[PDB]
């Protein structure tokens, strides 16, 4: 994590961008109009949309 260098008595903002690629299990139940990921994030779209 990037955090700002020290300066005296100053508020400093530091940005860290960590690109992450994670292979997860995704699961869907009938009527298969949405599916979740292993991260508990919902995707409101049919797995089969194409």
């Amino acid at each position: 994590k990037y955090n700002p260098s020290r300066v005296e008595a100053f508020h400093r903002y530091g940005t860290t961008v960590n690109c992450i690629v994670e292979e997860v299990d995704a699961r869907s139940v009938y009527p298969y109009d949405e599916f979740v990921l292993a991260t508990g994030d919902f995707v409101y779209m049919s797995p089969f949309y194409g």
């Binding site: 139940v29 979740v36 292993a38 508990g40």
Partner: protein, 50 residues
């Protein structure tokens, strides 16, 4: 006149046949429509795993 073996003479049954056959041993295998794990996995998300 002469001797005869018993099997040489036609034999008529004075007995009433009652044919009782034992109810055979039967084994009941562990059968479940859904196992415990299945039902656990049926949830779209598991809070513990997430």
């Amino acid at each position: 006149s002469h001797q005869l073996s018993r099997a040489d003479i036609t034999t008529v049954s004075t007995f009433i046949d009652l044919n009782i056959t034992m109810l055979e041993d039967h084994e009941f295998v562990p059968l479940e429509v859904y196992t415990r794990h299945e039902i656990k996995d049926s949830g779209l998300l598991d809070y513990t795993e997430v």
